[PDB]
Design a protein around this ligand. Sequence first.
Ligand SMILES: [Cu+2]
Ligand SMILES: [Cu+2]
Ligand SMILES: [Cu+2]
Ligand SMILES: [Cu+2]
Ligand SMILES: [Cu+2]
Ligand SMILES: [Cu+2]
Ligand SMILES: [Cu+2]
Ligand SMILES: [Cu+2]
Ligand SMILES: [Cu+2]
Ligand SMILES: [Cu+2]
Ligand SMILES: [Cu+2]
Ligand SMILES: [Cu+2]
Ligand SMILES: [Cu+2]
Ligand SMILES: [Cu+2]
Ligand SMILES: [Cu+2]
Ligand SMILES: [Cu+2]
Ligand SMILES: [Cu+2]
Ligand SMILES: [Cu+2]
Ligand SMILES: [Cu+2]
Ligand SMILES: [Cu+2]
Ligand SMILES: [Cu+2]
Ligand SMILES: [Cu+2]
Ligand SMILES: [Cu+2]
Ligand SMILES: [Cu+2]
Ligand SMILES: [Cu+2]
Ligand SMILES: [Cu+2]
Ligand SMILES: [Cu+2]
Ligand SMILES: [Cu+2]
Ligand SMILES: [Cu+2]
Ligand SMILES: [Cu+2]
Ligand SMILES: [Cu+2]
Ligand SMILES: [Cu+2]
Ligand SMILES: [Cu+2]
Ligand SMILES: [Cu+2]
Lengths: 299, 299, 299
Amino acid sequence: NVIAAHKGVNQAPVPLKMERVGPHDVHIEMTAQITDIEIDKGKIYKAWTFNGQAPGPLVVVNEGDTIHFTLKNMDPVVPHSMDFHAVHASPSKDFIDVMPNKSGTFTYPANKPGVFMYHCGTKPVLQHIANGMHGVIIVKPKNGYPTDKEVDREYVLIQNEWYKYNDMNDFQNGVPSYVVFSSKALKPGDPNTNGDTFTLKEKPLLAKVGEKIRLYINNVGPNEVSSFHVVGTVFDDVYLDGNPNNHLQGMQTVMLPASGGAVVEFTVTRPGTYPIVTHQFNHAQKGAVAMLKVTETGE
Amino acid sequence: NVIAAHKGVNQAPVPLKMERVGPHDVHIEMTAQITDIEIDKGKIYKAWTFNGQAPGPLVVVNEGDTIHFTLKNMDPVVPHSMDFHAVHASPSKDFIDVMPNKSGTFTYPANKPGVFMYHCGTKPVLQHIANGMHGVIIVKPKNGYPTDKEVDREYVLIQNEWYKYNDMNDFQNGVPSYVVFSSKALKPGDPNTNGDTFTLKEKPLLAKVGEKIRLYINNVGPNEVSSFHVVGTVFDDVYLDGNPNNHLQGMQTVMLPASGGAVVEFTVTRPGTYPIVTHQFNHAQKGAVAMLKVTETGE
Amino acid sequence: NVIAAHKGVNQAPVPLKMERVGPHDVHIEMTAQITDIEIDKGKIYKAWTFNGQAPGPLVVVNEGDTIHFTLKNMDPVVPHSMDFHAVHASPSKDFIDVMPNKSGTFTYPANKPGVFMYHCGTKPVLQHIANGMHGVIIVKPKNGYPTDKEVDREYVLIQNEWYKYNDMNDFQNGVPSYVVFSSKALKPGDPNTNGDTFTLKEKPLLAKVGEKIRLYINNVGPNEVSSFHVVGTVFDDVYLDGNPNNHLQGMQTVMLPASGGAVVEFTVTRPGTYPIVTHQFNHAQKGAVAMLKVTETGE
Ligand SMILES: [Cu+2]
Ligand SMILES: [Cu+2]
Ligand SMILES: [Cu+2]
Ligand SMILES: [Cu+2]
Ligand SMILES: [Cu+2]
Ligand SMILES: [Cu+2]
Ligand SMILES: [Cu+2]
Ligand SMILES: [Cu+2]
Ligand SMILES: [Cu+2]
Ligand SMILES: [Cu+2]
Ligand SMILES: [Cu+2]
Ligand SMILES: [Cu+2]
Ligand SMILES: [Cu+2]
Ligand SMILES: [Cu+2]
Ligand SMILES: [Cu+2]
Ligand SMILES: [Cu+2]
Ligand SMILES: [Cu+2]
Ligand SMILES: [Cu+2]
Ligand SMILES: [Cu+2]
Ligand SMILES: [Cu+2]
Ligand SMILES: [Cu+2]
Ligand SMILES: [Cu+2]
Ligand SMILES: [Cu+2]
Ligand SMILES: [Cu+2]
Ligand SMILES: [Cu+2]
Ligand SMILES: [Cu+2]
Ligand SMILES: [Cu+2]
Ligand SMILES: [Cu+2]
Ligand SMILES: [Cu+2]
Ligand SMILES: [Cu+2]
Ligand SMILES: [Cu+2]
Ligand SMILES: [Cu+2]
Ligand SMILES: [Cu+2]
Ligand SMILES: [Cu+2]
């Protein structure tokens, strides 16, 4: 069930465009496009994406920024839209469909800090999210987190599921075929990957012995909850949804609803390879294990 | 698998009866009865209910009230019972079966504030809850919530699932056929509906631009968790189980276990239609989307 | 699909060995062994276990203890390992496989209080956990919990699932066949049972009217979350993962991720039998109901 007009389509990834236009105003431009992604070795999914990545590119703004967002729809036949969980907006005015080969621009404020999902909001929403149109926007708190001075390194990890291609019965009633992690870059040099079963096993995240690591995490679903755990450590501090006031300490595992986020911080005390899992182990067996390699130097 | 003695039975809804008999004592009388409910267009489920609604009628009492509860069982063949999560009681003395065409009266205190499930407790409990015998009791806190002065409007929403009719294999091992929201009235004029796939899309909840809305929510299950989210906003304040001490701020999505409740508050800043979902999107696709319509006047 | 070398093997349970060797140092020795357990009446599962129990024996240490742990692998063909969620360790050095008929010793610190899962960490981990190699380690806080002076009795309860025997397709893609509770002894005389559908119904936990009960609970999974609830009461105080700082009050139901723990406290006000459930009622129907019997004397 590949739509006839998508057969043979594979649009190259387009970089996110982003520029600050005032102390509290930021322009962001993203595309909706159809891009082949290898989600498991030998298995291509012709994903519906923002900017040719699934999950989509990371967006980072500051608390109190107003976002002036443009979506250019490169899909030749299906309309697409954008819903940022970070913003206050009218869904029926500001998260509306952009037609094929057209652009739309919408403006809305991000006044809460945290780790928010974004996704396409075109009906049926389950079809658009399951085919790949999901991502994270981080809204950095104006006053930071209480533990910022202790953090040595930070990474972003996103969990998603993949089902049988564009199969609405399976999206509604089936078990996931794969559950996967991806990482998105906060700064130049950091890994930026798609949701697949293998890249973060073959090319682990790096750290050095003794460091306190912060992960910004979100489970975009579409359908499952997550039981997020790093093997070999305990979370020193957890901020639910990345809001600094929702503080928990000393958690072994952090549940996340579908679309839920967190900031989690932990210390790695010995060199070695540390798996990162969802502890719902049927999903870990179906791809959701990433690796952190901790060395004496960090390289 | 409709029990022979229920074929042709459809008992009209009976109003909840409730009266205060002392500063801290309240009488409540409810029925158990068998009532046809249209859960999706064209699809009748011959539900097992309290008072002919599923979920059942809303009960609201004050912290510290003792409830003197009578159940009249109008089912001609199956016994029924009541378990309120709000109360301290002996299950084997106070949540016992009432036989067909009989009444029972039980007395127990509600000393904790919150948003509690109630349900039938007759074995097998899964069969009695899945066939419709669930509901919410709200216990209002003696000293309110810290944010009461900011709240402009409030509604109650309940999430439940429906399965294949009276099919114990499906109740145990199947995926839900429908997942639905209903609303129950806090005051005259407010919507009071059953768990179906369409009423709160066709007849949305109303609000005005700029208002802070409070929802009292509970996921009665029977089997699924919920990832509750309002599109276009972020929750300013969340009180888990409706206890004022379990305060979280700035959540995008609130997980609820089966039977879990919350009070959530959020601001609507622009006119439009705002979907209310569980963000486990397979369940939203199977009915669990309600609408909030925000106008310049509230009408 | 019983491995040829396990046909006919049923190793008798071996007691946990544990001794303190310094103010902050404790030796623990456990076995990995293959033991038949009756998980439902008439149904034997040839479990992969620690010490012949599934879940495994309870381990209790103090915050700040270093554990010097030895695993003796009595399985004649499959390697096994131990991962304690309580500790900081290098997974690729300290949670490594011990071969058949060999021993390994590993040393690591437990510096966080709480109710932690332990399990085998040998690939595929889902197979080793689902076949029975799970358990709990409690790390008692140095300064106790704020509510310790109010607690009259305490018990440990663990929830797990069972699937079709050693069937990796079912472990990954199937619904559980059984979901069960077990209790592990904190002191001599307390019940110590395996995860089965019947023992804690036939031989309930005991308490006396008026007591405040503390349960240390963990949901080891492997795959499901839990909605933990005691019928007839409300939790006065909840400490997520058993860390004293993660305090919630007045909860009807406590969600637990897979591997998540809690300390929950509640008061029983009337004599009777009080069911303990996961409120995801398909799992309660498949075994996950235990009983607490409350008498005027406690006997
Ligand atoms: Cu297509
Ligand atoms: Cu400014
Ligand atoms: Cu693969
Ligand atoms: Cu602009
Ligand atoms: Cu789309
Ligand atoms: Cu959303
Ligand atoms: Cu940073
Ligand atoms: Cu699923
Ligand atoms: Cu699933
Ligand atoms: Cu450091
Ligand atoms: Cu671990
Ligand atoms: Cu949860
Ligand atoms: Cu019937
Ligand atoms: Cu009074
Ligand atoms: Cu319909
Ligand atoms: Cu009375
Ligand atoms: Cu009933
Ligand atoms: Cu209940
Ligand atoms: Cu009110
Ligand atoms: Cu289900
Ligand atoms: Cu389900
Ligand atoms: Cu207002
Ligand atoms: Cu949203
Ligand atoms: Cu075997
Ligand atoms: Cu000392
Ligand atoms: Cu049985
Ligand atoms: Cu030693
Ligand atoms: Cu093992
Ligand atoms: Cu683990
Ligand atoms: Cu104790
Ligand atoms: Cu499952
Ligand atoms: Cu399941
Ligand atoms: Cu006492
Ligand atoms: Cu209850």
